[PDB]
Amino acid sequence: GMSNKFLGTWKLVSSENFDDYMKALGVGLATRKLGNLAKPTVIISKKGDIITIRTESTFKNTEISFKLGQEFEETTADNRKTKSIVTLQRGSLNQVQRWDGKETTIKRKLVNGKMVAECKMKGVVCTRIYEKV
Ligand SMILES: CCCCCC/C=C\CCCCCCCCCC(=O)O
């Protein structure tokens, strides 16, 4: 199952190419400016077979809960209404969002004690590094 080492509170410390990823998602400039500057936390918790991922910024939060393998509805931080699914593959949490005939992936893995999120939209890739608080 998901490693217990995912559980807890993670703080963003570095990011690369997030602006273009947000462009590719259709996010407008004003919102991209906040996404490029903010350093969110990501809180991962689990109760039974339900994993919860809560993202906190001072001006925008989000939260998803899911069971591995099972599709769920998600309203994203940029206000997309998606059908999403998270699977566990080779120790990574692999989240796919689908909306409007579009698709994006957000893979979260543990590497050297950090959480690495890799995001892909139509070949535009970004990486975000999180440390464990
Ligand atoms: C929720 C707190 C940050 C919100 C500020 C920016 C608003 C919208 C940008 C939309 C980006 C959607 C991707 C969010 C990041 C997914 C990968 C990650 O968790 O690091």
Side-chain angles (χ1 to χ4, degrees):
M2 179 185 74
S3 172
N4 63 297
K5 295 193 78 202
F6 278 102
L7 301 169
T9 294
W10 296 93
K11 174 64 173 181
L12 184 72
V13 296
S14 186
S15 180
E16 63 85 19
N17 212 39
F18 190 54
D19 184 66
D20 201 27
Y21 175 71
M22 287 187 288
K23 287 192 288 180
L25 294 176
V27 182
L29 178 58
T31 300
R32 293 202 314 271
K33 288 173 175 166
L34 304 177
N36 291 320
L37 180 61
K39 298 165 174 312
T41 51
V42 172
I43 312 92
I44 303 180
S45 61
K46 179 174 180 293
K47 289 297 320 201
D49 65 352
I50 302 182
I51 297 163
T52 297
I53 302 180
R54 182 171 179 77
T55 304
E56 292 183 352
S57 75
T58 64
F59 56 87
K60 186 57 175 166
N61 302 312
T62 63
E63 186 174 298
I64 57 175
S65 294
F66 56 85
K67 176 181 178 182
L68 294 168
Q70 182 227 290
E71 192 166 56
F72 62 100
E73 285 188 344
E74 172 179 23
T75 298
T76 63
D78 60 311
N79 197 30
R80 288 172 286 120
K81 294 185 56 181
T82 72
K83 290 187 167 135
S84 295
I85 186 166
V86 182
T87 59
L88 184 71
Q89 183 170 313
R90 295 181 163 282
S92 189
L93 292 164
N94 294 338
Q95 177 177 11
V96 184
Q97 300 171 331
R98 286 181 180 81
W99 71 108
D100 296 349
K102 299 170 176 165
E103 186 183 314
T104 186
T105 300
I106 296 173
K107 176 180 188 170
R108 296 173 170 92
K109 53 176 193 180
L110 299 177
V111 179
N112 295 131
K114 308 188 196 306
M115 179 171 67
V116 181
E118 170 174 77
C119 296
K120 306 189 177 193
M121 174 60 178
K122 292 185 179 172
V124 173
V125 183
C126 60
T127 309
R128 289 164 68 84
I129 302 297
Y130 291 80
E131 297 273 5
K132 187 73 157 18
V133 177

